[PDB]
Write a protein that binds this ligand. Structure first.
Ligand SMILES: [C]C1=C([C])[C]=C2C(=[C]1)N([C][C]([O])[C]([O])[C]([O])[C]OP([O])(=O)OP([O])(=O)O[C][C]1O[C](N3[C]=NC4=C3N=[C]N=C4[N])[C]([O])[C]1[O])C1=NC(=O)[N]C(=O)C1=N2C(=O)[C][C]C1=[C][C]=C([N]C(=O)[C]2[C][C][C]N2C(=O)O[C]C2=[C][C]=[C][C]=[C]2)[C]=[C]1
Lengths: 133, 666
C-alpha cells in the first residue's frame, strides 16, 4: 500500500524519469546544475552580508546616551507645560514619546494633560498642524 | 504442522480442503455433503501419513485399510478410491521403494521417454510401477541431465543442481530417506571482499543489503501499486524497474539538498535585509547624535524651544538605539540558525561508488538465483512461484546429487548415447527417430503408444531445430516456447591438496569492480569433504565467460583468492573443471525463468499434451499422443530438481490415466 520506508516513488516522478531514454539523466542534471546555482548564489549573499557587517562594525556604543531616571512627579512646571505643547507639535499623539520628552510625567498625565489644557493651548490647532506634516 | 495434517503439508496439499484435482476425481464427494468431504480428507491425509512415515516400502491398500479406524475403515471403496488416486498421482509409493506385489506379469502400452533427467526418470519409474512398458532415450552417456556431479579421486563436486531448498513439503525429502544422500545444512554467513581483497565492514555490509531488500520491495510497489508494468508498448523488466527506483532515490537526494540550501539562502537573505536596516539605523543614529551634541552646545540657561531640542533629540536617539538593539538581537538568532543549517546537511549521495558495487553483488546474487540478467526478468511475474517456497534450511548434497538420478535409474530400460532427432505422432501411435551420438549415421526407430518429452526448454528453443516434430507443434505451443526464458549459470571447480580458507564458513563472496561484471566469479562455496572450492559465474558474465579458456578462467579464480587469502596461501589447484551449459547441446542453458512478457501461464501451456489429428478424415478424435514434462512445465515449481521430479510424476499419472484408464473416478 505504501512504499517501503524512505523509498520515494511518486506517480508524477515515475512518469517523469520514464518519458524518454535519457529523461532520467536530464532531470538529474537539471537538479545537479540547479542546485549549484543556489550554492553559488549563497556565496554572494554571504559575501554581501559580510561586507555589510563590516560597515556595522563597532556597534553603536559610542553613540549611546546615559539613561535618565525621572520620578513621575505630580505637578506641571510652566516649563513642563511648554515642553509638552512643543512635544505635541512634534509628536502628534505618541503619548509615550511625549512622556519621554517631558521626562517626568505619566503617560496618563499626558492624556491627562491633553484634555485638561486642550482649551488654552488650542491643542486642536496644534494637532492639526502636526497632522498637516 | 504435525500428525496427519503434517502429512498434507509435507505433501504440498491443504489439509482441510480438497484440491482442484481431487474435485475432478471425486466430483461426487466435493459436490457432496461436508461431512463426507471431511471423511475423505482424513483418509487422504492419513494415507499420506503412513507412506510418509515409512517411504522405504510400498503402501498397499490392505495395509492402508488395516491401519484405518472406523468410522473411516467403514467405506472400503472410498479408501480404495483414495489410495489409488494417491498412488496414481505419485503422492505415495513414488521414488525408490520395496515392492510388495511384484510386477504385473505382462505389461500394457508402450511409452518412449525422451531424456533421462529427473523428470524422465521419475516418470519412467512411475509408469513401470504401473505395469507399462517404458524405454528412455538419452543423448548423453549418463543419466541425471542437469544433475551433473563430478567425481575424481575423492573429489566430488556438482556442476549441476547443488542445493535442496528446504525439506518442508519437498519430495526430495522422501527421496533422501529413500536414499543415502548425505545432506549438509548451509550456514548462512557469507562474507564479501571488494576487488582490493579487503573484507567488507559489517556495517556497510548490512547497510547495503538492507538497501537491496529495500530496493526490491520498491519494485514490487511500482508493479502493483503504480501498475508500472508496460513502458512504450513493451513489458517492463525487473531490471528497468530497479533502475527507475534507484534513479528516483537519487532524485530525492538532490531534491532534498536543494530544498535545504534553499532554506539557507532565504535565511541568509532575510538576514541581509536585516543588516541593511541595521546599517541605516546606525546612519541615522550617527547623525542624530551630532545634532544632539550640537544642540547641547547651546549652554543653559536656555529658552524653551532650545531646551526642547535637546530633550526631543535625546528621546529620538534612545528610541533608535532601542530599535537597533532589537535587530542586533534578531540578527544573533539568524546567525545561529544559519549556524545549525550548515550543521545538518542532508545526505550527500544515494550511494557511494563503493556503495553501488556491493549492491551489485547482491544483484549478481539475484541473477544467480534466477539464472538470468534482471533485464530479462518479468517485473510482474519473476517471483510468481514465491508462495510455494519450502521450509527448513537449505542443504547441499555432500556425496554429489547424481546419486539420486542414479538411484532412480536402477531398474529401467535406458538407452544412452541415443539422440532423438525426430518425433512423429499420429492417431495410431508414434515413432521416434534417434541416432547414435558416437556415430551419427547409425539410426534407430522406436514405436510406442505415447512419447513423453523431457527435452529442456533450451533444446526446444533451438533454431534450427535439434529435434523435429512431425507434425510441427501447434503455434500455441511454440509461442510459449519462444516466450519463456531459459537462463544460464556456470560453476568453476577448484580442487586442492589443502584447505586454505575458513572451514567454518560455507560460502563467501567477491565483489566485482564493474556493474557489467558483477556476475564474474562473484561467489565461492566450500561444501565438500575434500578441499574443494566452487565458484559461480552468474548474470551477463555467464554467457560471456563461456568463450574463454579454462586456464584463463581459472586464472582469474586464483587471482581473486590470492587477494583474499594472501598470495603464499593459495596453491595451484590439483584438479579443475569449468562448465558451459548454454554451450551444452543437450541443455542449451541452465533453467527456465519468467521472461518479461511471459507469465506463469506459459508454463501451463508447456505441460498441455498434444493430440494428433485423425488418420482418416472424419474419423473420431484421438487420444493425445505427445506429453511434456520437465522443469519448464511445472508452474509452481519451475527450475528445480524437485520441480522436474514432480512434473515427471504428474505426467506418468496423466499417461496412465489415459492408457490404462483410471478406474477410481465414479
Ligand atoms: C544447470 C543447473 C545448474 C548449473 C545449477 C542448478 C540447476 C541447474 N538447477 C535446476 C535443475 O538442475 C533442473 O531443473 C533439473 O535437473 C531439471 O531436470 P529435467 O527437466 O528433468 O531436464 P534435464 O535434467 O535437462 O534432462 C533432460 C535430458 O534430456 C536429454 N536430452 C537433451 N536433448 C536430447 C536428450 N536426449 C535425447 N535426445 C535429445 N535430442 C539431456 O541429456 C537430459 O539428460 C537447480 N535446481 C535445484 O533444485 N537446485 C539447484 O541447486 C540446482 N542448480 C543450482 O545451484 C540453482 C538451481 C536452483 C535455482 C533456483 C532455486 N530456487 C527456486 O527456484 C525458488 C523457487 C521457489 C523458492 N526458490 C528458492 O528458494 O530458491 C532460491 C535459491 C537459489 C539458488 C540456491 C538456493 C536457493 C533452486 C535451485
Amino acid at each position: 500500500r505504501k512504499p517501503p520506508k524512505g523509498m520515494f516513488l511518486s506517480q508524477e516522478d515515475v512518469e517523469a524519469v520514464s518519458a524518454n531514454a535519457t529523461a532520467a539523466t536530464t532531470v538529474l542534471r537539471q537538479l545537479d546544475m540547479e542546485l549549484v546555482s543556489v550554492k553559488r548564489q549563497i556565496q554572494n549573499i554571504k559575501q554581501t552580508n559580510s561586507a555589510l557587517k563590516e560597515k556595522l562594525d563597532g556597534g553603536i556604543e559610542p553613540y549611546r546616551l546615559p539613561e535618565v531616571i525621572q520620578k513621575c512627579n505630580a505637578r506641571w512646571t510652566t516649563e513642563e507645560q511648554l515642553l509638552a505643547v512643543q512635544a505635541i507639535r512634534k509628536y502628534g499623539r505618541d503619548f509615550q514619546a511625549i512622556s519621554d520628552v517631558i521626562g517626568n510625567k505619566s503617560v496618563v498625565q499626558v492624556k491627562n494633560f491633553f484634555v485638561n489644557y486642550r482649551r488654552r493651548f488650542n491643542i486642536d490647532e496644534v494637532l492639526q498642524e502636526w497632522e498637516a506634516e | 504442522p504435525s500428525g496427519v495434517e503434517g502429512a498434507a503439508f509435507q505433501s504440498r496439499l491443504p489439509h482441510d480442503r480438497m484440491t482442484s484435482q481431487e474435485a475432478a476425481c471425486f466430483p461426487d464427494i466435493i459436490s457432496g455433503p461436508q461431512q463426507t468431504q471431511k471423511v475423505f480428507l482424513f483418509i487422504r491425509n492419513r494415507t499420506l501419513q503412513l507412506w510418509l512415515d515409512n517411504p522405504k516400502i510400498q503402501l498397499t491398500f490392505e495395509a492402508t485399510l488395516q491401519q484405518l479406524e472406523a468410522p473411516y475403515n467403514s467405506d472400503t471403496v472410498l479408501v480404495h478410491r483414495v489410495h489409488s488416486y494417491l498412488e496414481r498421482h505419485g503422492l505415495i509409493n513414488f521414488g525408490i521403494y520395496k515392492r510388495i506385489k511384484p510386477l504385473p506379469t505382462k505389461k500394457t502400452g508402450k511409452v518412449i521417454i525422451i531424456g533421462s533427467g529427473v523428470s524422465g526418470l521419475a516418470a519412467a519409474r512411475q509408469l513401470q510401477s504401473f505395469g507399462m512398458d517404458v524405454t528412455l532415450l538419452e543423448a548423453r552417456d549418463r543419466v541425471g541431465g542437469r544433475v551433473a556431479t563430478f567425481r575424481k579421486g575423492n573429489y566430488v563436486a556438482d556442476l549441476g543442481a547443488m542445493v535442496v531448498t528446504g525439506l518442508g513439503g519437498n519430495p526430495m525429502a522422501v527421496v533422501s530417506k529413500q536414499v543415502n544422500m548425505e545432506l549438509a545444512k548451509i550456514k548462512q554467513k557469507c562474507p564479501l571482499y571488494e576487488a582490493n581483497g579487503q573484507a567488507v565492514p559489517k556495517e556497510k555490509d548490512e547497510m547495503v543489503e538492507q538497501e537491496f531488500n529495500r530496493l526490491l520491495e520498491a519494485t514490487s510497489y511500482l508493479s502493483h501499486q503504480l501498475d508500472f508494468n508496460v513502458l512504450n508498448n513493451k513489458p517492463v523488466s525487473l531490471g528497468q524497474a530497479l533502475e527507475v527506483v534507484i534513479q528516483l532515490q537519487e532524485k530525492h537526494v538532490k531534491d532534498e539538498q536543494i530544498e535545504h540550501w534553499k532554506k539557507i539562502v532565504k535565511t541568509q537573505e532575510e538576514l541581509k535585509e536585516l543588516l541593511n536596516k541595521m546599517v541605516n539605523l546606525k546612519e541615522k543614529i550617527k547623525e542624530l547624535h551630532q545634532q544632539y551634541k550640537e544642540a547641547s552646545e547651546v549652554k543653559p540657561p536656555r529658552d524653551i524651544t532650545a531646551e526642547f531640542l535637546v530633550k526631543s533629540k535625546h528621546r529620538d536617539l534612545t528610541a533608535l538605539c532601542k530599535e537597533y538593539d532589537e535587530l542586533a538581537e534578531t540578527q544573533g538568532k539568524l546567525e545561529e540558525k544559519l549556524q545549525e543549517l550548515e550543521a545538518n546537511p542532508p545526505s550527500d549521495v544515494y550511494l557511494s561508488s563503493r556503495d553501488r558495487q556491493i549492491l551489485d553483488w547482491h544483484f549478481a546474487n539475484l541473477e544467480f538465483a534466477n539464472a538470468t540478467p534482471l533485464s530479462t526478468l518479468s517485473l510482474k511475474h519473476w517471483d510468481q512461484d514465491d508462495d510455494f517456497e519450502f521450509t527448513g534450511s537449505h542443504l547441499t548434497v555432500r556425496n554429489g546429487y547424481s546419486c539420486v538420478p542414479v538411484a532412480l535409474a536402477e531398474g529401467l530400460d535406458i538407452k544412452l548415447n541415443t539422440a532423438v532427432r525426430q518425433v512423429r505422432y499420429t492417431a495410431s501411435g508414434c515413432e521416434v527417430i534417434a541416432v547414435n551420438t558416437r556415430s551419427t549415421s547409425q539410426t534407430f526407430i522406436y514405436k510406442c503408444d505415447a512419447v513423453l518429452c523431457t527435452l529442456p526448454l533450451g533444446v526446444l528453443k533451438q533454431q534450427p531445430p535439434a529435434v523435429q516434430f512431425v507434425p510441427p507443434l501447434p503455434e500455441w505451443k511454440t509461442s510459449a516456447v519462444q516466450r519463456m526464458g531459459f537462463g544460464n549459470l556456470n560453476k568453476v571447480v577448484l580442487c586442492f591438496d589443502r584447505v586454505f580458507w575458513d572451514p567454518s564458513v560455507n560460502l563467501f563472496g567477491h565483489v566485482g569492480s564493474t556493474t557489467a561484471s558483477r556476475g564474474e566469479l562473484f561467489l565461492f562455496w566450500n561444501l565438500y569433504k575434500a578441499p574443494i572450492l566452487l565458484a559461480l559465474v552468474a548474470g551477463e558474465a555467464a554467457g560471456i565467460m563461456e568463450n574463454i579458456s579454462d586456464d584463463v578462467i581459472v586464472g582469474r579464480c586464483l587471482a581473486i583468492l590470492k587477494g583474499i587469502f594472501g598470495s603464499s596461501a593459495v596453491p595451484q589447484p590439483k584438479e579443475t573443471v569449468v562448465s558451459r551449459w548454454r554451450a551444452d547441446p543437450w541443455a542449451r542453458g541452465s533453467y527456465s525463468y519468467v521472461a518479461a512478457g511471459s507469465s506463469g501461464n506459459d508454463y501451463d501451456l508447456m505441460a498441455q499434451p498434444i493430440t494428433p489429428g485423425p488418420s482418416i478424415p472424419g474419423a473420431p478424435q484421438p487420444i493425445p499422443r505427445l506429453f511434456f514434462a520437465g522443469e519448464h512445465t511445472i508452474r509452481n515449481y519451475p527450475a528445480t530438481v524437485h520441480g522436474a521430479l514432480l512434473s515427471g510424476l504428474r505426467e506418468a499419472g496423466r499417461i496412465a490415466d489415459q492408457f490404462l484408464g483410471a478406474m477410481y473416478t465414479l
